[PDB]
Amino acid sequence: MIRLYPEQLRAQLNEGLRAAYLLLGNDPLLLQESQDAVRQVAAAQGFEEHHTFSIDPNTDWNAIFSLCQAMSLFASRQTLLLLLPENGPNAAINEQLLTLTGLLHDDLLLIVRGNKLSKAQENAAWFTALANRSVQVTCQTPEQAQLPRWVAARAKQLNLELDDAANQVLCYCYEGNLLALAQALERLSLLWPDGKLTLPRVEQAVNDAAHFTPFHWVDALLMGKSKRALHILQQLRLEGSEPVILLRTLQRELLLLVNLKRQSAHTPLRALFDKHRVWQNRRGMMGEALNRLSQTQLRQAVQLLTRTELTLKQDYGQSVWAELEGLSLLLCHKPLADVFIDG
Amino acid sequence: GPHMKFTVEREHLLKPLQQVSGPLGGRPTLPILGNLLLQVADGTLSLTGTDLEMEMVARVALVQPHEPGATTVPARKFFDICRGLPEGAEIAVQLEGERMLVRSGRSRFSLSTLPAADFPNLDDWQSEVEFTLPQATMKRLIEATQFSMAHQDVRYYLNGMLFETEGEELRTVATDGHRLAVCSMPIGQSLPSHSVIVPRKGVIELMRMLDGGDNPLRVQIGSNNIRAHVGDFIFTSKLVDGRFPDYRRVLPKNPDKHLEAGCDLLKQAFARAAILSNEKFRGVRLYVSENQLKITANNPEQEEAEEILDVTYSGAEMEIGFNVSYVLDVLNALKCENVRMMLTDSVSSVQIEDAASQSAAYVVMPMRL
Amino acid sequence: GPHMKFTVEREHLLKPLQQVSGPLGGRPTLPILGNLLLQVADGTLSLTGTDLEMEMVARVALVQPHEPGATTVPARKFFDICRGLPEGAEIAVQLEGERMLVRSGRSRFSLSTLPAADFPNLDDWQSEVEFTLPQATMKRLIEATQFSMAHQDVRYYLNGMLFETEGEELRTVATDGHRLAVCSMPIGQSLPSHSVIVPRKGVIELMRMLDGGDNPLRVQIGSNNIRAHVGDFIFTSKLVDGRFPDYRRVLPKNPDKHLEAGCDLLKQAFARAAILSNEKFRGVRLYVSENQLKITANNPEQEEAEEILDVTYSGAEMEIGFNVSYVLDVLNALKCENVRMMLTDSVSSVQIEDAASQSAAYVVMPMRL
Amino acid sequence: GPHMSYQVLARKWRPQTFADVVGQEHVLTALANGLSLGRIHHAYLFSGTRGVGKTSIARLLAKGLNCETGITATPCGVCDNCREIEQGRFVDLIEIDAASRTKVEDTRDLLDNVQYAPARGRFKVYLIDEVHMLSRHSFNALLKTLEEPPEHVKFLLATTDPQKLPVTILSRCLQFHLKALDVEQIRHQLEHILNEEHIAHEPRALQLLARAAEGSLRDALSLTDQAIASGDGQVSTQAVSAMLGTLDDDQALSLVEAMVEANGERVMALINEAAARGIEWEALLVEMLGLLHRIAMVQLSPAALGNDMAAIELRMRELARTIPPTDIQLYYQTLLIGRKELPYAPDRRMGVEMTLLRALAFHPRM
Amino acid sequence: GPHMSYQVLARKWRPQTFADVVGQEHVLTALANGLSLGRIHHAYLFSGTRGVGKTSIARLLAKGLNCETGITATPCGVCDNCREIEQGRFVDLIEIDAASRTKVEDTRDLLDNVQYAPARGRFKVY
Amino acid sequence: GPHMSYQVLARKWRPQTFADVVGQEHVLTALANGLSLGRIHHAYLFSGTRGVGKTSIARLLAKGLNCETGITATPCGVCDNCREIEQGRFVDLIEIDAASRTKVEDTRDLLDNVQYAPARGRFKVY
DNA sequence: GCAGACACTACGAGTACATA
DNA sequence: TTTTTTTTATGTACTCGTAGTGTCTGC
Ligand SMILES: Nc1ncnc2c1ncn2[C@@H]1O[C@H](COP(=O)(O)OP(=O)(O)O)[C@@H](O)[C@H]1O
Ligand SMILES: Nc1ncnc2c1ncn2[C@@H]1O[C@H](COP(=O)(O)OP(=O)(O)O)[C@@H](O)[C@H]1O
Ligand SMILES: Nc1ncnc2c1ncn2[C@@H]1O[C@H](COP(=O)(O)OP(=O)(O)O)[C@@H](O)[C@H]1O
Ligand code: BEF
Ligand code: BEF
Ligand code: BEF
Ligand SMILES: [Mg+2]
Ligand SMILES: [Mg+2]
Ligand SMILES: [Mg+2]
Ligand SMILES: [Zn+2]
Ligand SMILES: [Zn+2]
Ligand SMILES: [Zn+2]
């Protein structure tokens, strides 16, 4: 059971194909690159027939019968690709993968891709059945701390001169969308054959196609960055994510913040975080959030959140995408909020 | 003015319409693609039906006075108008503005038309090779090979059927990766060796197009299309730039075992085994002895089927499993008194032929079970 | 669960198995609804199929040793197993626990079962009245009114057909709110008027059971259920509860305008005119003039169709718009040569009748005029 | 008939050379350089808002790729292939209205022609328009085709919403996003189009027409034709101004502007117009409340402008700067009370008028 | 008056010509000018509140498009086409009640027959 | 047994003629005037509170509209059409519980079936 | 006969979206 | 570095797989 990064994939690919390759993660670009590299090296090894099946509760399940072990009529080595759903496999998909793994042979190479499996599913019977035979590839989006380094690395891959300001602009505009970043690098290489990249046009050949998640929004709120929080909210509204998931994601952290602020007057935050099982990534963030906010601001935040919840589940109105905005400004570097606007 | 003056007999018109309306189907890629092209010229009417890869043209002679012209008419509507009229009834046709007036006695219909300039026309070409075949020969070539053709495969090579011509021999090859069928027939003419691909719909149209009469069939194969002449019907279809293997290469070059069995009994036994075989996972296993050729199958319902034959054999025992549907199709295509079966290994191919005929050969690839 | 050893011949079962097949398989709504009931009792085999609201059993004579009991056997599997055996081949069945071993010569099949108790049956009852009608007459009754039944209409009444009796006449009425079909035929026996409503599916199995034989169909009319008997075949079904519309109230009150013509000519003309009819409405307009009939059809494609028929008419000219599918179905049912029509007004119901005899009658309600 | 012949401005003036497409310079330059260097991706997916030339630019690409003079950014009109592109009857260009042929049957039938060589062109070019709506199985077939595409086939997908496209197709397609056209470019090309035709025009009227369209060129040209029809053959300022007043929709913004300036006659005229343009009063009052909320929020941080107010930013910035937060809070409270009170009032027009009067009464304007 | 058939005023007094339409001077003038001068656009959308004339004006435009006296801004009542339009039996005025035919299959069917030319009319109106 | 089930007063005492109304005179005068003259309309919408009489008023209107005596302001119970309308089973009076069948499919089927001519009734009342 | 083929039409199920 | 995260009731389309129904073709 090997574990690897995309950068190291060639190292395993030029050594010899394993029984199967699992492409887990959430980056379309990284997963696509890994799958394409595996397919290319398999074709170099003499793999010609490719069949792609999407795992769905209603999809075809002829893949089990597709393992005829009789291709010999033409004798073209087969590669099988499976696309896991957004939430990963279910029980039925579990035994389907069990019976597919049980029929694996040398002539067939299995490529499995999808969203990263949770711990409850990482102990599934089929996944264990792939032990000592499979190479997992970790493809998780680098965060804004690590994203500029990745952008610089890919720019060096294309032999393009990337300026720091251009790197920052591309990181800001295309956060959470690596495929968009690769397309932008290709498009800017096409626009400028000279190879350099500077502000006057990288700020022109770009759009706000960033994709975010509610966790990014909650992190922005905790760090008190109003501009980033509002931009993330706008991007999430444009993407069409349901407001209820935003409400729940912010409610969990806000309730934790209220409890921690209440308990801070008697116990140091260092022990409080450990009691509440706060991860090292978020301990400092929540410490700064607590040090920035007072009880009154948290009470106003929860009042606004309650009003938003009521106006969402009772009046069915569309004003929620406005109210959340105010809640953003309610918790960032001197909110200076109001009462009638929220109360 | 341009008028489609027609005075035809329903018996001279039903069959050509029944032929030209074949390739046409519902939901066309263009509205013009759903209308048959009428073209009256000289003293004959040309009926044209196209799919952007076919042109099916039927020429019908005329006797009554008529005026030249070209237009289009809906396929199903006009065909049913011709069909519904009484036997021996004349059909008169005219064009007024953009309306085709079809009259017969007192019956009158006014169908909607389209301009004839918008109808696509396949480009002119020169024929590379020319064949002359009997109807029965081409019929047997198609019916005994088309069943093994692939269906909607990602590899566009296997979607069609291969014609391989060598000297006085013409053979058809069809495969899907798991089955393969080849059939060779003799011709009275010397012909250059040539391998050509015909698409699935093309071979379907070719099979349905030929009649049961004794009229000779003419074949033309060019650089990138094929044409067939049968009486007053001409069908032209594009080809496929594809790669196919050697039939000898796929079949066991050195066969190891020989079996001779009755076709009907084996068909019945395989069908009976397929009854309890999984409807999706169609497949059985055969175990061979001097007389026992046991066929076994089972379903996820734990219902097992085992059956025994009385087949001549003198070699070693062997267990080979494969899809029941493949052998059922092979036997149904054979239509022979006795069948010979050649086995080499479980992971190797399985050949099937006619015990008194080497004209048609079939090979199936057994699946591990 | 005693052992179940059948020893039967195909020729005595394949027809009863086909008859008992009916509406089995298809859509399995729940498992214990089951496949068949095989019962051995007193040297007879009873084979039962159901639909959770319907039941039918075939009786097969057992001229050989047997073991009484009741169990189940899969419908499609048993039917195809019996069908695929060699003609006249014997069948030997054994029961081991819940497993059926079916043997034919050297062919062996294993089958799964379900307990006979889990099967759902229909509660017994006391029959109300009983008829013994000839098969040909019953077929004439059913075929004259089968087509007019509604297609899953909200008005549940229209989803079936009514059988009623008056002395020596049996009257059958079907309707869907736009068509009416009534047929009265002599019985030979006098029984009180006990109307019954049979659903469409039940009527379908009544049609299937009839074989045009000399054995008269026996029927037991109950309160909320129906039973039928054809030789060794017994059938039963539920009933639609309610009252049908009064056909006498639907039939025209003043059928002053009379028309008579040939069935074949009218059917062919209507078939020709329906080609250009609106595929969503199928409405045609009929103009009746002195000794002349005119049919006009239009469709959204703006195509026009006109047809003229020679007829005998002594009344005044009239325009009436009505469905062409309905009249086509009526003429299809009417198998004689000459057909008469009774008309009253431009928006009045039209009565279709046989010219030879009153026999059966039909009513068509016109479209918007 | 007896009216000579006059086509539609929207369909006419569609560019036939890459130099006739106005705006979207980055996409055109990138395509030109890609065709010059011979670096062509397998699939080009265009995207953007309505009426910015995605289909027109894709058609230009299809014309260029099969030009007999060679693959160039400026295909000639001379080539008979180019002429057949103009007429819409080209064997090697397959235009598929994917909005109509959504089912997998038709898509598979049209994608089974990839095995056939082009008739008279270097590349078999598919122009699948409105790709966003397409059955899932049709997406599977298209993905299977794009995974192993023949070297003589190039795809030209067009859409309005790229989000609905599956990620598996996006990851295989070079995506070109087209910006909403700037107002100045729209006005410039509108001036040139009106001058090329024999239609008189006025500068302020032209500016009004350009501003009315929300950055989409088709909107601008459609409004231009409608104004010409209403303008008695002349694009006059008064006629187009009255037309746009009739088609004016953002009533709530003008209501807020008049209310905050305590202009009773102006707000009465505006509400009369909003009554004549039949609308829902609850929706109008909700829009007013939301606009006031946004104005209150922007004063706290400019970043509250976002993207929705791209065409509204100019007035909202002035309103946020010039008005104290307390007055905005009082107006928001008054309008919220009015909205709560509206259904129980007389016919809702009366209630909206009364709420606006309540809000107006606060200022000392007489 | 003399009509014993007491036709509903909502039906009997539907506008016949552009002179019988009260109000809506904007749309009336626009259509009159765009039909007298020419330049007939290929798609119209009448947006307004209930019972203002969202359909009758469309029928008036349909009458004004394909009239025997040519493209006219004054729909006559003498030729067969205008009277057929008013009676609702006209061949080319395909009145698509989008409420009933709302499924995509019906729209595909409507688009399939678009090229099949008009019968007894300058234009076919959908 | 005259009451096989308890014919509750809310069902037994349903009005059968226009004279049994408890005083909805403002609408009854309009209904009687309309039926007496030729002024008949094709869409009546009775609204108000619960248990006030609008379903009974509608049924009385149908009885008056379909009775074979003629279009009578006072329906006659002797009429066969009235005999069938007061009970169920009338081929013309199609009563649809809108809440029971809210789906657009049922309404579309009803509007497809409305085209057919009525059976033996002056007006097909929905 | 004729039953299979082939069409053709309908129904369930899974999915996406709307309005309240 | 790792997991974290949803409001239903009712209705309306859309599209594909599977089956039920007609009918008719050389079988
Ligand atoms: N970039 C552009 N340059 C010139 N005209 C344009 C442009 N974009 C849109 N148009 C105008 O709009 C009309 C329709 O444009 P089209 O490209 O079909 O838009 P879409 O992206 O929605 O398919 C064109 O005829 C043209 O007049
Ligand atoms: N502008 C108008 N002039 C005259 N009558 C009108 C006008 N608008 C509506 N009506 C009346 O309303 C009836 C139906 O109008 P209609 O045009 O169907 O309105 P809609 O726009 O809702 O379809 C007409 O018969 C007419 O009596
Ligand atoms: N105007 C009335 N005259 C006599 N009885 C009435 C009247 N209105 C209501 N009722 C009584 O109320 C019962 C229900 O009346 P109904 O007409 O169904 O009211 P609704 O308008 O709410 O449907 C009737 O059975 C009758 O007893
Ligand atoms: F043709 Be565009 F997408 F409006
Ligand atoms: F009655 Be209108 F068309 F709304
Ligand atoms: F109870 Be009533 F119909 F309002
Ligand atoms: Mg477009
Ligand atoms: Mg209307
Ligand atoms: Mg009521
Ligand atoms: Zn050129
Ligand atoms: Zn006229
Ligand atoms: Zn009466």
SS3 assignment for E58-114? HHHHHHHHCCCCCCCCCCCCCCHHHHHHHHCCCCCECCCCCCCCCCHHHHHHHHHCC
For C:43-62, CB contacts with B below 8 A are none
Q: Distance, angstroms, CA C23 to C1' H19?
A: 12
Other C-beta atoms lying within 10 Å of the C-beta of residue D321? 11
What is the C-alpha to C-alpha distance for residues B318 and B307, in angstroms, rounded to an integer?
16
Pull the structure tokens for residue A256.
């934790």
Q: With contacts defined as CB-CB under 8 Å, which chain B residues touch E119? A: 98-99, 112
CB contact under 8 A, B307 and C108: yes
3-state secondary structure of A120: helix
Pull the structure tokens for residue C314.
């002594």
CB A84 within 8 Å of CB A112: yes
Q: How was this structure determined?
A: cryo-EM
Q: How far is CA B191 from the centre of its chain?
A: 23
Q: Is E24 in the pocket of ligand 2 (CB under 6 A)?
A: yes
Which of 1.20.272.10, 2.30.30.90, 3.30.110.30, 3.90.330.10 would CATH assign to domain D246-366? 1.20.272.10
CB C85 within 8 Å of CB C104: yes
Residue C26: nearest nucleotide (C-alpha to C1'): H19
Which residues 6+ apart lie within 8 Å of D90 measured at CB? D66, D81, D84, D121
Residue C152: nearest nucleotide (C-alpha to C1'): G10
In 3D, which of A151, A139, A137, A143 has the Cα closest to residue A180? A151
Proportion of chain A in helix, strand, coil states, percent, rounded to 5: 55, 10, 35
Q: Distance, angstroms, CA C33 to C1' H20?
A: 20
CB A156 within 8 Å of CB A42: no
Q: Does residue D144 reach within 7 angstroms of strand G, measured from its CB? A: no
Q: Is E113 in the pocket of ligand 5 (CB under 6 A)?
A: no
Residue E55 marked as a ligand binder: yes
Write phi, then psi, for B206 (nearest 5 degrees).
Answer: -65, -45
Residue E72 marked as a ligand binder: no
Q: Please, what is the end-to-end C-alpha distance for chain E in angstroms?
A: 34
CB C211 within 8 Å of CB C255: no
- CA distance to partner chain A, nearest, from residue D25 (Å): 9
CB B163 within 8 Å of CB B172: yes
What is the C-alpha to C-alpha distance for residues D180 and B350, in angstroms, rounded to an integer?
64
CB B348 within 8 Å of CB A72: yes
What is the C-alpha to C-alpha distance for residues C343 and C349, in angstroms, rounded to an integer?
7
B177: number of CA atoms within 13 Å, CB side? 24
Q: Write down the architecture of domain A143-213 according to CATH.
A: Orthogonal Bundle (1.10)
Residues in chain E: 126
CB B347 within 8 Å of CB B269: no
Instruction: Give strand ranges (E) for chain A.
Output: 2-4, 20-25, 47-54, 77-83, 108-114, 134-139, 161-162, 196-197
What is the C-alpha to C-alpha distance for residues E61 and E43, in angstroms, rounded to an integer?
12
Phi/psi zone of residue B97: left (φ > 0), alpha (ψ -120 to 50 degrees), beta?
left
Instruction: Give strand ranges (E) for chain D.
Output: 43-48, 93-97, 124-129, 153-158, 174-178
Q: Does residue B26 reach within 7 angstroms of strand G, measured from its CB? A: yes
Write phi, then psi, for C32 (nearest 5 degrees).
Answer: -65, -10
CATH fold group of domain D182-244:
Helicase, Ruva Protein; domain 3 (1.10.8)
DSSP state of C312: B
What is the C-alpha to C-alpha distance for residues D31 and D176, in angstroms, rounded to an integer?
10
CATH number of A1-142: 3.40.50.300
**Rg (alpha carbons) of chain D, rounded to whole number:** 26
Resolution in Å, one decimal, please: 3.8
Buried/exposed B335-361: b ≥16 CB within 10 Å, e otherwise: ebeebbbbbbebebbbbbbbbeeeebb
Nearest to C367 among F89, F101, F115 (CB): F115
CA D89, D90, D93 angle in degrees (round to 5)? 125
In 3D, which of B76, B68, B100, B69 has the Cα closest to residue B17? B76
- List the helix and strand counts (H, then E) for chain C: 7, 23
Residues in chain B: 369
Which of 1.10.3720.10, 3.10.105.10, 3.40.50.720, 3.40.50.300 would CATH assign to domain F6-126? 3.40.50.300
What is the C-alpha to C-alpha distance for residues A287 and A170, in angstroms, rounded to an integer?
30
Which residues 6+ apart lie within 8 Å of E112 measured at CB? B31
Single-letter amino acid, residue C78: F
What is the C-alpha to C-alpha distance for residues A138 and A179, in angstroms, rounded to an integer?
16
Handedness of CA B113, B117, B120, B123 (dihedral sign): positive
CB B313 within 8 Å of CB B235: no
Write phi, then psi, for D238 (nearest 5 degrees).
Answer: -65, -40
Q: Which of F11, F14, F52, F100 to mutate to test the pocket of ligand 6 (most atoms within 8 A of CB)?
A: F52
Q: Distance, angstroms, CA A68 to C1' H16?
A: 26
Which residue do the tokens 């703006």 mark? C302
3-state secondary structure of F126: coil
Pull the structure tokens for residue D231.
């303008």
Strand ranges of the sheet holding B69-74, from the earlier edge strand across to the other edge: B69-74, B35-41, B44-50, B54-61, B233-238, B225-230, B217-221, B129-133
What is the C-alpha to C-alpha distance for residues C204 and F39, in angstroms, rounded to an integer?
51
Which residue do the tokens 């006419």 mark? D12
* Burial grade of C38 (CB within 10 A; 0-12, 13-18, 19 or more): buried
What is the C-alpha to C-alpha distance for residues E100 and E90, in angstroms, rounded to an integer?
20
Q: Which nucleotides of G are covered by protein (CB under 7 A)?
A: 7-8, 11, 13-15, 17, 20
Q: Which ligand is nearest to the CA of E53?
A: 2
Nearest to E6 among F38, F108, F111 (CB): F38
Single-letter amino acid, residue D141: A
Which residue do the tokens 């289909």 mark? D55
CATH fold group of domain A214-311:
Zinc Finger, Delta Prime; domain 3 (1.20.272)
CB B180 within 8 Å of CB B362: yes
Q: Distance, angstroms, CA A281 to C1' H24?
A: 75
Domain boundaries, chain E: 6-126
Pull the structure tokens for residue C256.
């002053």
Distances (CA, A) of F66 to D20, E16, F118: 70, 34, 11
CB C229 within 8 Å of CB C164: no
**Contact exists between D and B (3 or more beta carbon pairs < 8 Å):** yes
D306: number of CA atoms within 13 Å, CB side? 20
CA F39, F44, F46 angle in degrees (round to 5)? 130
Residues at CB less than 6 angstroms from ligand 1: D 10-11, 13-15, 21-24, 50-56, 217-218, 221
3-state secondary structure labels for all residues of D129-190: ECCCCCCHHHHHHHHHHHHCCCCCEEEEEECCCCCCCCHHHHCCCEEEEECCCCHHHHHHHH
Which residues 6+ apart lie within 8 Å of E86 measured at CB? E16, E59, E63, E77
Pull the structure tokens for residue D315.
């007035």
What is the C-alpha to C-alpha distance for residues D140 and E77, in angstroms, rounded to an integer?
57
Distances (CA, A) of E38 to A228, D130, D199, E56, E72: 54, 32, 14, 21, 9
3-state secondary structure labels for all residues of A247-280: HHHHHHHHHHHHHHHHHHCCCCHHHHHHHCCCCH
- Among all residues of chain F, which has the CA nearest to that of C253? F120
Instruction: Please give the interface size between A and D, counted as residue pairs whose CB atoms are below 8 Å apart.
Output: 92
Proportion of chain E in helix, strand, coil states, percent, rounded to 5: 35, 0, 60
Which of 3.40.50.2300, 2.60.120.10, 3.40.50.12780, 3.40.50.300 would CATH assign to domain D6-181? 3.40.50.300
Which residues 6+ apart lie within 8 Å of C71 measured at CB? C1, C4, C37, C38, C95, C100, C113, C115, C116
Residue C27: nearest nucleotide (C-alpha to C1'): H19
Q: Is E97 in the pocket of ligand 5 (CB under 6 A)?
A: no
Residue E48 marked as a ligand binder: yes
DSSP states of D228-262 as a string? Answer: HHHTTTSB-HHHHHHHHHHS---HHHHHHHHHHTT
Q: With contacts defined as CB-CB under 8 Å, which chain E residues touch F41? A: 8
CB D86 within 8 Å of CB D77: yes
3-state secondary structure of B114: strand
Other C-beta atoms lying within 10 Å of the C-beta of residue D183? 15
What is the C-alpha to C-alpha distance for residues D84 and D68, in angstroms, rounded to an integer?
12
Scanning chain B, the segments in alpha helix (DSSP H) are 10-20, 75-84, 135-143, 200-209, 247-250, 263-276, 324-334
CB contact under 8 A, F117 and C177: no
3-state secondary structure labels for all residues of F22-83: CCCHHHHHHHHHHHHCCCCCCCCCCCCCCCCCHHHHHHHHHHHHHCCCCCCCCCCCCCHHHH
C271 pairs with which residues across the strands?
A: none
Distances (CA, A) of A179 to A146, A182, A185, D127: 16, 5, 10, 23
CB contact under 8 A, B367 and A68: yes
CB A36 within 8 Å of CB A11: no
Handedness of CA E30, E36, E37, E38 (dihedral sign): positive
C192: number of CA atoms within 13 Å, CB side? 3
CB contact under 8 A, F38 and E8: no
Strand ranges of the sheet holding B107-112, from the earlier edge strand across to the other edge: B6-9, B90-96, B99-104, B107-112, C304-310, C292-298, C283-289, C318-323
Pull the structure tokens for residue D282.
């609850």
Buried/exposed B266-299: b ≥16 CB within 10 Å, e otherwise: bbbbbbbbbbbbeeebbbbbbbbeeeebbbbbbb
Q: Could you tell me the distance, in angstroms and rounded to a whole number, from the CA of residue D317 to the centre of ligand 8? A: 42
Angle at which helices D237-246 and E25-36 cross, to 10°: 130
Q: Which of E11, E14, E24, E55 to mutate to test the pocket of ligand 5 (most atoms within 8 A of CB)?
A: E55
CB D208 within 8 Å of CB D238: no
CB B165 within 8 Å of CB B131: yes
CB contact under 8 A, C154 and F113: no
Residue A315: nearest nucleotide (C-alpha to C1'): G20
3-state secondary structure of A182: helix
Looking at the CA of residue F56, tell me the nearest atom of ligand 3.
17
- Among all residues of chain D, which has the CA nearest to that of A185? D174
3-state secondary structure of B261: strand
What is the C-alpha to C-alpha distance for residues D57 and D37, in angstroms, rounded to an integer?
19
Provide long-range contacts, Cβ within 8 A and 24+ apart, for C45-52: C45/C6, C45/C8, C47/C16, C47/C17, C47/C20, C48/C20, C49/C20, C49/C21, C49/C22, C49/C23, C49/C24, C49/C75, C50/C119, C50/C120, C50/C121, C51/C22, C51/C23, C51/C24, C51/C201, C52/C120
Q: Could you tell me the distance, in angstroms and rounded to a whole number, from the CA of residue D60 to the centre of ligand 10? A: 11
What is the C-alpha to C-alpha distance for residues E89 and E83, in angstroms, rounded to an integer?
9
Write phi, then psi, for D301 (nearest 5 degrees).
Answer: -160, 125
Distances (CA, A) of A113 to A53, A83, A220, B292, D311: 11, 5, 30, 47, 42
Q: How far is CA A41 from the centre of its chain?
A: 27
What is the C-alpha to C-alpha distance for residues E93 and E125, in angstroms, rounded to an integer?
5
